[PDB]
């Protein structure tokens, strides 16, 4: 009948009495400090929209890149610590380019997914050298591409594994964004409807005012390639609201 | 009267080195004297019983043709250091085609000893060494601590009751001392505070000259003890 | 603040207080459990503060079905007016920056209540004193200059060993609040005695038994011999049962 | 006389013990630090009295 | 041994290693198993507890077949016992491949005991938590019985018992005259001892597992036929 | 109270003769949803339950395909499940590609247990935190196997693992006497009825939270999901 | 944490307590060994205890054959002693392979001590709790007796003892050696020393005797009949 | 420096505001209104139970809220019935650290205690925290246990908590305050194997509805059941760590 | 190797505190030379007038250094400095700049405070030398790896008072070797009764396009202290 201290969150190889990995849980919790991103995939393509928050008028908006182009048919959106995602982006680009250069085909989204996920799980490996990564990555990703199987969307978290999805939101306002998406998404909707719904949800969740300078938008289509909207297109789409 | 878990003592020195020195100070006495021509090394080899075999292990060991040494502390550490010293001397002779100078060998041994005072998962050696040599018609005498700090001396002692031995040497040292007189003085210093009867089998004597280093046969030790 | 269990608090003039310390191994707390269980004290009040983490449970010293459903808190006071004894028990841990205020309040209560003397049971780390630990008894004692000369003579007769000074100030690693209590008692001129033991964390029942025997050598609360009633709450000190399909 | 011969003569335990000893001693190893002498490693390997 | 019992590379002030002692204590929370060496063979007996009715009969066996002529009975952690059985199989196969004839039980016991002892010296591993016995028979060698414990000590025996109730089983075995008996009586004696040393209230219903290797089997380790098991169980029940 | 010093590492024995990290790892199996496995004279069936959340956020692969005659279901840690699945796939593919013959289920399970026993004895490692149910068909007939984080495996006539699987286990024990003579339809009905016992008194099985895997004689391993489970779901009675 | 829980930490007085605890671990066996060197022979005598009546007494021994001309007796933990014997055999084989001739007793003892020294300077491994006594005959020196210890210290002796009652055995042997041996006298002296120290009248099945002789330089283990004949001659 | 310590202390303060006017109360909450009954729920399941089975009838008016910051922190809102202003209700869905519990007690209760006030506390704990001679996994979870003060005349609807088990944190703080200051109170514990929002865990609290404290606040069951079933379909999205 | 919650290095702080208990060393830069002055804490009559803890080491023909800390670490660092200088000379056929040598040693010193699991070196240095790029120079170093140039500085025991007196009595562009020696003697006497056998003095200068490094003799030290005593007697 005495109250004593006991801790189980010191290492990554320690189980709690209820069977939990607190270090991995904290790494996952680290994503709540990032901005909100939304990804929707339809029968015509995948739409990605992200919010970039500028903390001072002296900052340059063009210096923030939260949507990148892995290849001509794959795109990605980040949320969390942007410095951590550089290695994963470089690995994906190298894998895709090497496969094309060697065989003259294009890798599948699942293959690029597996290649990226191999590196993100370096912690906990059997014979990993001490000089390599020793902690989970503090970043979450949203992969979207078009393959011969049609449009696809994948999600990754600091846990290290990818899961396919239809409409996912990540970031600080993920709960509200997903709640809004639940009553909007349906299987017969189109790319323009997806873009409009994502912009509406972003405007609803953002604290600032939507003015086509603090957001980014991109789409991938089976016919065309990865395309990122410009200022004029963003203004034209926003003025509809 | 004090136990410390820190790295540096309040006096500004490493705690483990102080503990190793305390271990060294509890060993058998050793005496080294540098004369006008040659160096003499002596030590106490008292055994616990007559059942022992004195012709089995030796405390005075030669490194090369002109270098020898004696210790005061833990035997196994001295044994593991002697082989490394011999290997270093042989490597230097192979590389430079010339016998190694005494100072270089002392420096290398001290570096090896110091290496163990910085790494983790190991402990420092618990020995102190006296090294004698002969180079360019000029004798040498060095002493090294467990931490690897070495100085050149003219007469010194370690082990038990080393302060009284140092006082005795200071009182009875001369700049023009001869080798025979140096041997007599070293034996007298050992005899001081011996708590027993000194024979030719419970002490070891080694000398260095221009002809090299060698360990004295017990008959010669008995002859020297006869004079006293 | 002492809150009586009844309407009016009793008088404690000339009483001696037995107090534990939250130290390594909980040896003082286990010894207090042994003393309270064996001597059969009764609750008289609580010591309500804001320095210990709250906790609650049923009666730790239940001997029958009738009294097995009595609530208990993290700081309680027991007494035996027949032999002029009062005991304090702490079943929790301290919050940050809350030890010195607790010591000050407790010593203020001791001064105001009219108690005669205080005895503290504690413990210290068993690997941090000297080579003298390995070739000597593991029991040490401390005294306050205000202590009576008869107590000092009796202690000298008992042939005990005093805690060594540190270069001179008293240092008790792993002792918790015992050093602060000793310093404040010396400052306020309160008769205090400290009895401790060198231990390590693990199973510490023999340590508690040794400490209570060491105290009994002086206070003589039991018959003089080489016995102690184990409380009923010492049941599952290592946890729950073994899962199946392993052995 | 090698690991295969030792395994065939004595058993699986001897080379395992030798390799565990080697790995335990070799823990003093780092790249960006100064040169080091492997005294214990040479003693265990038995080449502390020969020159390569 | 508080303060000196967190690693296997630490000595107690009185010269003891407490991790190995805890590993050996870890064997005492497992069901007891006995083995008796006879005039012309060795007989094994295990008291096996049933976990649930959803398991197929013949699973969670505690009597292994190391080789064509070696039998094994284990107690303690099951995974450690399985790994040790694999090690023993590998050693026997290697000896067969090299020297061209069946390995004597003494050499196999020595090799496995040394492998077990190799895990009690370093702080990077932990000692095994299982005990086991080996039995064999040959025309030119007779019956053999051995024991290996977590510390790494192996000895030859005339009658052995491991598990939770090894003391009572050993006391019961000491009253036998196994040096002049046969297997057909040793099986019944083993069944009677197992039924005697079983606790009906603390432990639930159990099943009896029996085996031998001996002359009537021509140097092979097999399972007792059903009729003999039934007769032995009936004899044990009527005696108890 | 005294467990603090002995429940942080997997290479430390308790004075009672126990290792608490293995038990803690075994406690992690109940963090996933429930699964049910049962077999008949000629068929083996795996039935799984999907998470109650929406399907838009994540698609869950509870039943996986290992070979033409082996399939598994998982409950626990996704990374450990992925590692074990890759190991089993490599073993089966190597066996086929080299010796032109299928790999026995008992041999595969023994290899899995031997592989999983290793990290429970080394320093700086942790046990696997996943549980498996294995269904296969070979020369000896149908098989159902269960794997534990403690590197223990069992041969079962029927078993259920996951969160709140005690009711399913009780149902399986009660109705286990008639599984051998049942055909495919009744076997799947029994599996679904057993799985339904882990739900609240008002919920019911739906095509969007049920997955089925079937292997047997003259039938390779097949996974039914979404609208493919309608023929099996039809015919079930009210609770 | 602590000067006695670390093998690689000195105490304030300059002591290593783990080595002392390893020395204490030798007495856990409860047996005593005595080795006596003669004019042209060496004799080792140990004490045998087989309390259990269910234990095969033929499998209990403490005398080992390292080489065809080298013997050994071990005191302390059984598994540690067996591991030490295996390591000694491996080292002897390696020396023979590397140098083309059989290893001498002093060289084998030195190699064993050098191996034992490393365990005392690293924190990831512990010393072995056993003591080794080797006997043999040199080509140009005669009989030889050597002894090891967990600390890594070795020396040659005329007579020595290990285990419990070692101090009493040494005190008994000192007077005999000072007073001042044939083959029969060496065995009789060793048996008398053990018997007087243990205060037990010995039986032929209660001790083990191993000898080596200049005439027959191969290690031999005496049989029960020979031990009984020696006991009758002594009495 | 002292400045960083002062800033940290100020960052972890507890404030009792009023969201209608955004002004902090200068007096204790119970010192401003008379009280005869007080029901406190801590955790997701207890809050859901009270919001589904009690707060579905009558008119409840909010009178204040608490604001705090930890590394694990979520709201704390106080209500009282409009028809009966002497009945209060609290719903704490956040975590209160050990250094903020006494601040919470001072803000809510104050330094002046009064009698004639029943207090009921609801919370949940994991089944692994339970101590028993047999295995933890063999217990028929979830189950209910209770602890009472010495002047609680009524009897609990569940067996009292066994001896070697103890409770700490905020419910322990409230029970200790009530025991010290002689206020009748009772604490209900639900040991469950699912600590998220679950239907069975919430339904484990059903026997408390028949007690005298909640006798006059429960009107109809089926509406509460429908509300609870609707509420369970709006749970947060989990991670990819388990499957 | 671990940041404190306030952003400090406890190992480096402990090393600096330990160095704060070592011997006192002095360095003064003049218009025509630079000198070093140290304190001989230990002395015996039986030393062999060589390797007698001579605290003024010679790295090259142009540079010298002084040490306040652990003797073995000092030996290791000095040996490394000698190899670095010889290697640079062999590579470039030109003596190494003093600042480059100091930076090369400081990189090694700093690597130990960031990498591995070894303790940092508890040694502080004081470098004097001449080169064609800047002439006479005087630098300092500490275990953390920081370094900087000075005109007058002191390390060791009671260094604060020595620095204060140096800054009070030091004038830039007006001091020569004699005035520098007198000031050093005064500061050492104030910071330490001083005897002529308890100090070591070394000087650096140029003699017809050649660097000359010398160590003052006992007679010269006695003459200097006698002159200082005469001056202080004349003052009062």
Residue numbers in the entry:
A (entry chain D): 1 to 241
B (entry chain A): 6 to 233
C (entry chain J): 1 to 167, 177 to 235, 244 to 264
D (entry chain H): 62 to 113
E (entry chain F): 5 to 244
F (entry chain E): 1 to 239
G (entry chain G): 7 to 186, 189 to 243
H (entry chain I): 34 to 106, 119 to 288
Question: What did the original publication write about this model?
Answer:
Dedicated assembly factors orchestrate the stepwise production of many molecular machines, including the 28-subunit proteasome core particle (CP) that mediates protein degradation. The CP is composed of four stacked α-rings and β-rings, each containing seven distinct α or β subunits. Unlike conventional proteases, the proteasome harbors three different types of active site (β1 or caspase-like, β2 or trypsin-like and β5 or chymotrypsin-like), each present twice. Previous work identified five CP chaperones: proteasome maturation protein (POMP, also called hUmp1)29–34 and proteasome assembly chaperones 1–4 (PAC1–PAC4).
Structure 1 represents an early CP subcomplex and consists of the α-ring, all five chaperones and β2. Structure 1 shows PAC1/PAC2 and PAC3/PAC4 within the same complex and illustrates POMP-dependent initiation of β-ring assembly through its binding of both the α-ring and β2. Together, PAC1/PAC2 and PAC3/PAC4 bind all seven α subunits (zoomed-out views). PAC1/PAC2 is perched atop the α-ring, on the surface recognized by proteasome activators. PAC3/PAC4 sit on the opposite face of the α-ring (that is, the future site of β4–β7 subunits later during assembly). Consistent with the structure of the orthologous isolated yeast Pba3/Pba4–α5 complex, PAC3/PAC4 occupy the α3–α7 side of the ring, with α5 binding at the PAC3/PAC4 interface. By occupying these sites, PAC3/PAC4 not only stabilize the α-ring to provide a platform for β-ring assembly, but also preclude incorporation of the late β subunits, helping to order the incorporation of β subunits. Unexpectedly, PAC3/PAC4 and the β-ring chaperone POMP directly interact. In structure 1, one end of POMP is enclosed by PAC3, α7 and α1, with the other end enclosed by PAC4, α3 and α4. Lastly, structure 1 reveals β-ring initiation with β2; a PAC3/PAC4-bound complete α-ring engages POMP, which co-recruits β2.
